[PDB]
Design an enzyme around this catalytic site. Sequence first.
Site, short mmCIF file in Angstrom:
data_model
loop_
_atom_site.label_atom_id
_atom_site.label_comp_id
_atom_site.label_asym_id
_atom_site.label_seq_id
_atom_site.Cartn_x
_atom_site.Cartn_y
_atom_site.Cartn_z
N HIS A 20 0.81 -1.21 0.00
CA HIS A 20 0.00 0.00 0.00
C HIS A 20 0.85 1.27 0.00
O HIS A 20 0.31 2.35 0.22
CB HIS A 20 -0.95 0.00 1.20
CG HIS A 20 -2.00 -1.07 1.14
ND1 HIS A 20 -1.72 -2.39 1.43
CD2 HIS A 20 -3.31 -1.02 0.82
CE1 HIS A 20 -2.82 -3.10 1.30
NE2 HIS A 20 -3.80 -2.30 0.92
N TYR A 48 21.69 -2.96 -3.37
CA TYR A 48 22.11 -4.32 -3.74
C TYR A 48 23.62 -4.43 -3.79
O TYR A 48 24.19 -5.47 -3.42
CB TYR A 48 21.48 -4.75 -5.07
CG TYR A 48 20.15 -5.44 -4.87
CD1 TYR A 48 20.09 -6.80 -4.62
CD2 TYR A 48 18.96 -4.72 -4.88
CE1 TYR A 48 18.88 -7.44 -4.41
CE2 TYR A 48 17.75 -5.34 -4.67
CZ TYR A 48 17.72 -6.71 -4.44
OH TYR A 48 16.51 -7.34 -4.23
N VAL A 126 14.79 -11.07 3.02
CA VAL A 126 13.86 -10.01 2.67
C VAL A 126 14.03 -9.59 1.21
O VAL A 126 13.05 -9.38 0.50
CB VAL A 126 14.03 -8.82 3.64
CG1 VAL A 126 13.33 -7.56 3.12
CG2 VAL A 126 13.52 -9.19 5.04
N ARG A 127 15.27 -9.47 0.74
CA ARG A 127 15.46 -9.03 -0.64
C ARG A 127 15.27 -10.18 -1.62
O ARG A 127 14.36 -10.15 -2.46
CB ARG A 127 16.83 -8.37 -0.84
CG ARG A 127 16.95 -6.90 -0.31
CD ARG A 127 15.75 -5.99 -0.67
NE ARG A 127 15.32 -6.08 -2.06
CZ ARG A 127 14.32 -5.39 -2.60
NH1 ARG A 127 13.67 -4.47 -1.91
NH2 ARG A 127 13.95 -5.64 -3.86
N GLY A 130 11.96 -12.31 -1.54
CA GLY A 130 10.93 -11.45 -2.11
C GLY A 130 11.06 -11.31 -3.61
O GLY A 130 10.08 -11.41 -4.35
N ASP A 131 12.29 -11.09 -4.08
CA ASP A 131 12.56 -11.06 -5.51
C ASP A 131 12.08 -12.33 -6.18
O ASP A 131 11.40 -12.29 -7.21
CB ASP A 131 14.05 -10.89 -5.78
CG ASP A 131 14.58 -9.57 -5.28
OD1 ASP A 131 13.79 -8.61 -5.18
OD2 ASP A 131 15.79 -9.51 -4.99
N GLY A 135 8.97 -11.11 -8.08
CA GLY A 135 9.62 -10.34 -9.13
C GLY A 135 8.93 -10.47 -10.48
O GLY A 135 8.85 -9.49 -11.23
C1 COH Z 1 2.64 -6.23 -6.16
C2 COH Z 1 3.67 -7.04 -6.04
C3 COH Z 1 4.51 -7.06 -4.82
C4 COH Z 1 5.01 -5.95 -4.00
C5 COH Z 1 4.85 -4.45 -4.10
C6 COH Z 1 5.78 -6.70 -2.98
C7 COH Z 1 6.46 -5.96 -1.95
C8 COH Z 1 7.58 -6.53 -1.23
C9 COH Z 1 8.55 -5.67 -0.54
C10 COH Z 1 8.55 -4.18 -0.55
C11 COH Z 1 9.34 -3.43 0.21
C12 COH Z 1 9.49 -6.61 0.08
C13 COH Z 1 10.71 -6.36 0.92
C14 COH Z 1 8.88 -7.90 -0.35
C15 COH Z 1 9.45 -9.16 0.08
C16 COH Z 1 8.69 -10.41 0.06
N1 COH Z 1 7.59 -10.58 -0.71
CO1 COH Z 1 6.70 -9.31 -1.87
N2 COH Z 1 5.81 -8.06 -3.05
C17 COH Z 1 5.06 -8.27 -4.16
C18 COH Z 1 4.80 -9.60 -4.67
C19 COH Z 1 4.94 -10.77 -3.80
C20 COH Z 1 4.26 -12.03 -4.18
C21 COH Z 1 3.39 -12.31 -5.37
C22 COH Z 1 4.65 -12.93 -3.08
C23 COH Z 1 4.26 -14.38 -2.89
C24 COH Z 1 3.10 -14.50 -1.91
C25 COH Z 1 2.12 -13.38 -2.15
O1 COH Z 1 2.17 -12.39 -1.40
O2 COH Z 1 1.30 -13.50 -3.08
C26 COH Z 1 5.50 -12.04 -2.24
C27 COH Z 1 6.11 -12.54 -1.02
C28 COH Z 1 7.27 -11.87 -0.43
C29 COH Z 1 8.15 -12.59 0.52
C30 COH Z 1 8.06 -14.02 0.98
C31 COH Z 1 7.34 -14.25 2.29
C32 COH Z 1 7.64 -15.70 2.60
O3 COH Z 1 7.36 -16.57 1.73
O4 COH Z 1 8.20 -15.98 3.69
C33 COH Z 1 9.16 -11.57 0.85
C34 COH Z 1 10.35 -11.66 1.77
N3 COH Z 1 5.68 -10.76 -2.66
N4 COH Z 1 7.75 -7.87 -1.10
#
Ligand code: COH
Length: 210
Positions: A20, A48, A126-127, A130-131, A135
């Site tokens: 958000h 990075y 976290v990086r 999440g990537d 990604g």
């Molecule tokens: C709109 C796409 C989007 C955004 C803005 C976003 C923003 C961020 C963000 C911003 C600062 C960080 C540091 C992360 C880091 C993560 N994301 Co995302 N993620 C995103 C798409 C996802 C998707 C897709 C997953 C897999 C599960 C889910 O949430 O659907 C996800 C899961 C993660 C996970 C894995 C959790 C676990 O399996 O233990 C991490 C770590 N993340 N993400």
Amino acid sequence: AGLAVELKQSTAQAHEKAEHSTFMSDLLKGRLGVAEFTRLQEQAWLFYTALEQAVDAVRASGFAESLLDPALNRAEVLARDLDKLNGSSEWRSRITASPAVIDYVNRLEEIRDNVDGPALVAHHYVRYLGDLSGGQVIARMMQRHYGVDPEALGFYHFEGIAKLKVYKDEYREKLNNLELSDEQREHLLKEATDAFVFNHQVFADLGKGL
Ligand code: COH
Ligand SMILES: [Cl-]
């Protein structure tokens, strides 16, 4: 629960708040453009780069060696993305870190110099995880909304990883099998919270003046 589950549970609130972010939701919904996408990737190249020096140091110490897969390295892939987005290598000498990235980089250099294994793994989770997990979604949105060419999106695809769902399962199993004292474990969990705060602040700095 194992490490991988509590990492997910303890950062789940921060992940939803990140989605958000005013800057990030504007970028993802098509309200910004390629230039702002390029600004974000320039800041990412900066942290990075620092992250991967800390990873190099912790790997050299013997800690979590299996988790610290060098195929995950993003800095040179981002640099090639940015040579394409900007039309030259001129950006390398020009970009300056935002205040959020200054602090993020400072912490990563602190972790490198202290060879703080547990904290580094927190940033690594976290990086990179999440990537690996989201990604593809972000890169698709940049294509669909802004027509970003896929060859400027290499950061979002891991060339040296064949099976993606299998790699993510093994990563979590390596997290689970990490040997940690109670204090190291609390240090890692706290750092995962901090790593999301840093990333949220990077978004806030990018949103300024919009
Ligand atoms: C709109 C796409 C989007 C955004 C803005 C976003 C923003 C961020 C963000 C911003 C600062 C960080 C540091 C992360 C880091 C993560 N994301 Co995302 N993620 C995103 C798409 C996802 C998707 C897709 C997953 C897999 C599960 C889910 O949430 O659907 C996800 C899961 C993660 C996970 C894995 C959790 C676990 O399996 O233990 C991490 C770590 N993340 N993400
Ligand atoms: Cl690299």
